[PDB]
Symmetry: D3
Subunit: 311 residues, 6 copies
């Protein structure tokens, strides 16, 4: 699509991962997705103006263009690739497959250039194209996906998560925060042996006794904003009450385990469905901006088990 | 009142509980209450358009008219009796006693037709007329009421809960989520030996160690939306901060114990006091719609203690 | 400043602490602060119209003018000194130092008249002038400050909390609820040996195992509304998601330990940044009104450790 | 029986409860029981030589003969009535009914002389005669018994606890620490509506979330040593592994609630079945001596709910 | 070996699993192992004289000879095959391989006769021969072993657990209660990807938040008595302090998940190393007798996840 | 004394801390104390024959004579200085001051030779002489002592812990596991502002929520075996039931925080008071041997707070 021309032209014009990044995790590339959502996508820009300091005592640094120099000192570089859909490039609206190919190509290039791709916005279709872009490039590596949502979203044959499971690129799937499980959901679950932690199960077992998830396989983090309670993230289609707090999600996200992060998809946010402050700042934009930040931090600090190392 | 004519005409025209429902709990009848609240009551309709799948892996099925056929397979039938107040039946507003008699007659008929009555909306006066409608029909059965509210609401001689305690139809009362207890509240408490779990008490003891309440007596569930924190349910008169989350309420509601559910009253919701999304969907309507659903599920799965049964 | 003339004229016209108050803690004086915030400050008035009953089974009593008579029976008198800035006293806006001197003089007088000063509104600059007003009058007494905020706010040399630490009037500082710690924040922390409990640390250790803080030194409670999650208190500058619930803050506030309360500063609230109900009631005003109440209660019930006393 | 002559002669020669003890709980009378156990009963004497300081910051004071003067200052007087069976009063062994009548008469006299009777040793038959001695004297008062044992011990028609339930002197029964429940046990349980907390139930719910039991009715504490794990109290018939630690029992005992303590029965200890140190001190004697002490303390500090009182 | 002649002659003379046992789990066969331990093995006989009632409200029934009739009513039949080593059959001592072949043949026959084999006593070499006897008969079925011990015991090439991992009959291994991990232990661990839960890890995460282990593969339970603290089970070689209580082990054992139980090995008990009561009853015999009972119960109630089923 | 001649001759003949040990903590010197205890002291020798692997994945290495070479790889060197009292050096028994001077001189030399002194055995008088030996050499450094005991042991003017507090060499004292607090104990406590965590307080707050103690001052660890429950450590004078398990003590010991460890005193063990296995191995010797090992490990891994460091 010509809507992604200016964007993609800049993506494959990015200077690759430096030789000084050798064995260390990262760096992180960031771009704005917008499939299935209104043309106006403020989540990316709202994140770029947000404070740089994370929960854990580190700091994000954002560069529009490289080269991404590797830091010695709690600095975590982020490559802002901007919005995928070029504003004022026409009144046209990209199709589902146009978004697919555009996301597939962008995430492919960023991956084999050493960057960990982080997609922001959209309907979650970026999850499909990103782990596929990873599976094409790394046919040997097995992928496990941690999914945060109010619903399993795998009862639809065309659903991004099921398509991955039907094509069989996924070694395992961990669903977190489900609270609307259908009859077809339970069936698709059992067939693929999905691991799940529903809201009532998480809340009754204690959230403090959920320390980690444990994985040796590369992890893809797919975060639907609907996993959060409508009080924290009301800007979602079909809100389901009794969800995670923003702090709850951050706690569980801190327990993600694995070798490297193959990609991140933060989605489900619609500006037309948000609760706004009197200064017209959306409540969900505030919540997700924090989650995106701690997600980028996670790509720099991901490992296996929670241990007692060093002297 | 003529305002309830079309409604009540349909209620006592309902085909009674089938012979195939014998010993199993249910079914559930549903109707819209609106005493002390504005004429426009959207909570009932908003619930009917909500997803059918519950937290626990079951499914609600809604029928406007019977006969309510008993399922073999995680189906929970619900009889929608519609709004009690017929819209466009006049500009008149029903009185407190007109709402009382209308609710008393409707709940009486539904009860002795085998249905478990669930009232949605109003100011909580439905609680009075429903357990009375149960006590008239079942003089032998003793009633215990689980009450969720920010305030005991028993310091007023005309308060629906105290009237029940003054007439003495109640064996015991469990107040949950109180955080505004007055001097007169403590006195009325001690006289009737009310069991209570204030917010600070619940939160300091741990919410995960609250597994059940235990009861051998038929339970009536009276849910005031004010028990929820204003961040989740702002559509209440005199909001009191430091309340339960929607998930918190769902957890405690799951611990309700007893033989059968005599009735449910979800109230305290006013559309004029809600926090709205940009698409004009109320935050409290979203919260309560989830609670109503898990309440109907509770009427189908209610028992005593939490055990290890079967092979 | 002439803007505080009518206010201050009334403050030093207050009949001092009665001889019947001898060894008991209190009483409590209350006034409205408004530095760094819009001229319209509704938080004070909104609190005065709020319910008087606290979480703990006591009751607030509010008097515009004294004499403050000491109760025998769960009554906690509060002296309402009104708004510091006299409305319609000119179109002028008081300066930072004008607010400082005005707050310094008011809190000084109220302190040596036996009252525990509680400041409501402003940007937190009241924290500086109040513990200074306490240190001037009580040069022997050492002060420890419990600080609730999303950020340490001590990386700025002109920051109210650092100025206290640079002048060295503080024996110790306890920061609670931090989740945006900068590089300069960690450095200023280590130099003064600040005790801190970040959000991720508090949430992972369990909030129920946080029973008290323990102190033998007089405590000043500085409460920034930003410590609360934006879902509960959105009316703050630069909202940081993943914060405390209103109940969370109340629980931690209940654990405050010390001999007496030297003063309270509830701030960070801006009406222009609040999420409003359809009846135009701000969500943050509701949250803070509860916190102010339990703060006044804390000044009447403060002690050391949590014990098993009496028979 | 003539075996109890010297003992009983001293019991009804005890100067009654002083007028200065009016409304305060206590005092406590102590005597040695020995039904169903070997003639040599060292538990009483071993307790009298044990340290006087309790867990809670108080102190036991022991007097062989009165008058028991009421203290102002953490002193808890105990009247040592000595061993019921007079040593070297013959080679005879008292019968079951001889122990019954002897215990019934002794506990009767001590009760109506104002003392709270505490029986040490025996097989638990003292439980029967003591609450009966209380029911004769106080026909109006209702009794609830908290029972600590590895087994319900109510499947036998002649069992001390069932005899009380068959004659119906008991309002309610709370069984704690059961881990050997038979088929007949479940049946007798359901008939009398016994409340029980089995070991697996207690341990899986968390022992820290067991704060109190709550009761408005006078409590009798019957403590079988078999409720303790054999590692702590091996001196019992038919030891059942997987029991409470000594600390576990002390924690649960601290949660006992009620107006007054009607009596205490510590039993199940047999010197022939104990694990001994190299200095020939029994392990169970050490454990029970601590429990007896905190039981006497409980009779002086018993109340309803766990509250926030005083200033 | 001729030492096992009388035993083995009886084992393959056992009437096979009845046709009425079709899809239900069980039944359970029981025999006494004694490799690496003194000739006198009292653990089996001590278990047979122990109470039949379990923690969970069921009951064990023991039959020396069949046919094992299937119960309708909380009855769990156990086939006592007696001691493997025939006492007074000679002064000879069976070799390591003689114990191996004897255990391999016995467990093979019992398995393909429908019985779940439970071995009691020995040094843990029964673990090797039993899951091998299962792997020969069921080549398709994959085996996962839950191992309870103070030490991984896989650093020795001839160790029973490593031999299984070197031959590769094991799909996965879960080590529970380790507290003496060597350098070679960590290496063998990583190579086979063993899942482990050390004592400090279990105790710091909370034992109540350990609800289950989760498995879809048939489970073999290997229980070394050394996993228990020496205070509960001192009768082990090289006791390691800071171990599980008997209740702790029972709690974790209750969380075992899987389709069926392939076998149980309770070992590590030596009568010469036990702490004895004055009546010469061993403390470890008491502890293990309880664990064996709840292990047999586990073979009758084993499933996957901990759910909310039925109506 | 001539009884310590052969020992002390070897102590000041020890080659000092190597230059390769520069900034790293350690190494650790070990010697056997025996004041107030029988001549036969088997605890030291029993520890030297115990397994070398710790709870945390490290390994102890023991050398009778140096030079103590610094390891790169989870090795923790220990210098065994042997028994202070030379066996068969006479029938004489060293006096209290002879033990004092002998311990003072030995610990002094080991300290200024770079070694962290660990004393094993005795009555706890080694605690006095060791932190004094540290205070003489390091007059600038302030000392905080973590004390594990069933009793505060500071009500006696001649008590080792009070003597330190009367001379004022201690900055702060943390008492852990107290359960026998006297009237004089509370008074001496308040005067010196001792921080304490009694058994009932520790157990009711949850042992899992006790993560660390926090200190910036050099820590001395004084461990009385009486802090452990008599079931784990019966070899103490005046056993007090309801104490810590061995695992409990290990958990709390892991939470010790500070710069360096100034010394360790493990005492209170008497072989004449132990519970023995049938092979005559003492139960307390087993428990303490584990604690000594994890104490030496603590001297090598001690730091401040529990953090998230490294990449």
């Amino acid at each position: 699509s010509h809507m992604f021309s200016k964007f993609l032209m800049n993506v494959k014009g990015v200077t690759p991962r430096g030789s000084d990044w050798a064995n260390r995790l990262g760096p992180v590339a960031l771009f704005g997705y917008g499939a299935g959502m209104p043309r106006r996508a403020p989540l990316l820009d709202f994140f770029l103006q947000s404070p740089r300091d994370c929960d854990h005592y580190a700091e994000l640094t954002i560069h529009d263009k490289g080269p991404i120099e590797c830091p010695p000192v709690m600095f975590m570089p982020v490559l802002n690739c901007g919005q995928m859909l070029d504003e004022a490039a026409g009144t046209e609206t990209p199709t589902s497959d146009e978004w697919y190919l555009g996301s597939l190509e962008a995430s492919t290039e960023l991956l084999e250039k050493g960057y960990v791709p982080v997609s922001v916005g959209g309907d979650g279709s970026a999850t499909l194209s990103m782990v596929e872009a990873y599976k094409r490039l790394f046919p040997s590596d097995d992928i496990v996906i941690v999914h945060f949502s109010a619903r399993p979203s795998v009862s639809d044959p065309r659903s991004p998560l099921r398509v991955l499971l039907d094509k069989g690129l996924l070694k395992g799937v961990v669903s977190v925060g489900n609270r609307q499980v259908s009859s077809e959901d339970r069936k698709v679950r059992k067939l693929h042996k999905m691991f799940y932690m529903d809201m009532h199960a998480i809340y009754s077992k204690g959230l403090f006794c959920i320390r980690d998830i444990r994985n040796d396989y590369p992890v893809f983090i797919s975060i639907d904003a609907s996993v959060l309670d409508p009080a924290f993230a009301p800007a979602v289609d079909s809100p389901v009450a009794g969800g995670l707090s923003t702090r709850d999600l951050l706690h569980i996200m801190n327990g993600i385990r694995g070798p490297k992060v193959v990609g991140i998809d933060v989605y489900g946010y619609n500006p037309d469905l948000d609760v706004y402050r009197k200064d017209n700042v959306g409540l969900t934009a505030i919540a997700l901006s924090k989650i995106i930040k701690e997600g980028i931090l996670k790509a720099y600090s991901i490992s296996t088990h929670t241990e007692e190392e060093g002297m």
